[model samples]
Target: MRVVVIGAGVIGLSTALCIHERYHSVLQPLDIKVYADHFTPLTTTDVAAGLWQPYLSNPQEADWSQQTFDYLLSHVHSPNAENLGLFLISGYNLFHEAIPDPSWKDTVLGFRKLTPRELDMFPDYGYGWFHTSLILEGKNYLQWLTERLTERGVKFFQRKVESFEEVAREGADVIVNCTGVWAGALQRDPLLQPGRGQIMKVDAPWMKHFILTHDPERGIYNSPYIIPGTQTVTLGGIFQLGNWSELNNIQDHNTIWEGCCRLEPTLKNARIIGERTGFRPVRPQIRLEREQLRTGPSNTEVIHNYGHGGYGLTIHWGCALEAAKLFGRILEEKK
Candidate 1:
């Protein structure tokens, strides 16, 4: 069996890993190839905070998000988990005003209401309580996953795929499109757009928990989240819809820094390591469906597993499982 996965971001890599694991035993000579133009730190996954917060624009994506949280949390305490930069962390979401939706509280572990004193910690924002969640350092995690896949005999190729026809010419039995934001261009799905997110990695040893603040008037916002293992805090961000500019804007950088400082006065002294910008592949609904591609001589199989927006790390496993199942079905039919 030969499987070609496009896009090496968190979604693509994770899907390839899952597919390889599931079929390596049954398909003795399975040939899995991952195609991507960029990997590791250059990918959008690397620029993200890699927290397990479910912020799906569409409610239908809840199942995949839940599955991913379960998978990551299950392996969070394992010794090998450190290789993937996975760990359990305590965090709080401070809302400037109360949120009516109970979905996030119900889905996430250790979620609770904030006390008067706890709420007082952030004077400028409304209060929320801490929750235990998984934090994945993409810089380490993606490399670890790629190495694991490589060791399992999955071949990786560095190439930019312009269309399904190009992938078909590669002689792949099945193609999985995990091209995040680029899916808009490759698949020509106008519904897909870039949700421009800007974040800054800062050195804040004192910050221990994640602080999130949401103001209805100002829009969605969050303070610096301190990852337990990395000790590097991530302060973000903006959700400018349909923006494609990847270059860092000085004004956005200052805005994030100032906003974070306002939430945590200690962050004012934190050293600014660097700033990053990514166009999160956002759609009205995440695309995790199967499609039959019109190949040159015959119809080609394609499974789409992209448009995760900002929740790629949080929802990766579940989406991968779904994609793997589709791949398995395709394999079975071909056999």
Candidate 2:
């Protein structure tokens, strides 16, 4: 079987890995190729804070989130965990006054109410605690996943696809679309938009736990997350929905640095490492459905798995596995 996966971001690469594993033992020497305009650090996945929190503004379903979280947690203690850059960490989320929703309390392990003294740590914020979560350094994780996929004989191509017709012409038996924000142009999706986020990675060796502070009116927040492999702390962020500019505005940079330092006074002396701005693929709902393309002059089987917004890293594995299952069903029906 010949399969073509589009987009080389976290979603696309994860799907490729899952599909390759499924066919490795039984197929007639499966051939797979991944096409993308850019890969690695250039992809938005690299710029993410890489936290496992499920910010459910874009999508309502939690199936994908639950699946990915469980998969990562199961592999956290494996020998390959270190090689895959996976680790266990505790995180705290502080709101200005009260909890917005209690639904997430049951989903995350050790969800509890913070004490008065603990709340006093961030003088101006309300508090909550999550004793278990994940922090993935995108740079290391992406490179590791790419190398693993390549070792399984999956070919990768660097090219910007103008249309799905290009994929059909390549004789792809199945096409899995995980294009993220680029789906806006590639699929001409009117409902798809960009959520702009700006973050800064700083060096703070003393920091060991993750801290999240939420302010109600200012729409400003700080999360002090320590990455495992790189040992750098990430202080972030701003979720500006419907914004498309990628350049790091000087004003936003100043706001992020000043806000984070105010929440954690110890960071007052931290040196600035780097700043990044990227547009997350925002959609009304997470797209994970199949379609048979009969438009234009070509016939193709397309399965879309994009529009993950900011939770791409957190929910990638589960979504990839689901996409692969659907692809298997499609092939089975044809036979």
Candidate 3:
């Protein structure tokens, strides 16, 4: 079986990995190729804090996130943990308006409500919850997975795939679309719009845990969040719906800086590193299903696994598992 996967960010790489791992033996000889315009440090996944929390996602997304959490948790105890930058980090999700526990509460480890003393630490935060979740060192994980896929005989081509028909013309038996925001243009995905976010990476090694503030009445989209990665702490962000500009803005920067500093005063002492702006491919629901493309002389098999918005890392593995299985079923029918 031959497969061509478009997009090399977290979603693309993870899906390709799952397809390869599951079919390497069953398919006798499985050939896979990953085509993308940008990889690793240049991709949107690179700018993400890589926090495991499920934001801008749905209730059904919990199952996939749970699977991803389990997969990352397994590596946290293994020798590959260090290289993959897998570790458990506990944090708080503070809210001014009290709400029920999130759907992913059970998916994470050590999930519990914050005590009054803890809530007192942050003024205007009436209630909150804390849980331990895996955080991947964004770029490190992407580059590591790229090399791992390379060693496993998966080929990579540096190219922008404009259409599924293009890969079909290239002799691909199966095409997997993980183009993230680009899917809106490539597939003419009406629901897939750009949700802009701006974040800064700062030197805050002393900051060990993550903090996210949300207000149900005011809206959770523009809440300030601080996620401490292995080397740097990520301060973010504003969620702009249907906004396409990737350029950095001082306004967004100030919003993050001032908001985060208020949440954690120690952030005022943190050294400035760099800032970035990226788009999350926002959709009402994730598109992860098999589609039959009839753009050529014959029908082409295409698997869509995009529209993850900001939770690509939060649910990549479980979604990939299902995508791989879907491909397996497609191949079975090919016989």
In candidate 3, the residue pairs with backbone N, CA or C atoms under 3 Å apart (3 or more residues apart, or in different chains) clash, namely none
* Clashing residue pair totals per candidate (backbone < 3 A): 1, 1, 0
Best by TM-score: 3
Error of 1 at 158 (Å): 1.0
Best by lDDT: 3
The lowest-lDDT stretch of 10 consecutive residues in candidate 3 is 53-62
CA shift at 217, candidate 2, in angstroms? 2.4
Candidate 3: residue 174 Cα off by (Å): 0.6
lDDT of 3 by residue, 133-166 (tens): 8898768888889989999999999997777887
The per-residue C-alpha lDDT of model 3 at residue 240 equals: 89
TM-score of each: 0.93, 0.91, 0.96
Runs in model 3 lying further than 4 Å from the true structure: 56-59
The residue-by-residue lDDT of candidate 2 on 195-265, one tens digit each, is 78888878876777788765556553323333322467777767787778888888777777777777778
As a TM-score, model 1 comes out at 0.93
Q: Which residue pairs collide, candidate 2?
A: 95-126
Model 1 CA lDDT for position 206: 81
User: Which model is ahead, 1 or 2, in terms of lDDT?
Assistant: 1
Worst 10 residues of 1 by lDDT: 220-229
Order the candidates by TM-score, highest first. 3, 1, 2
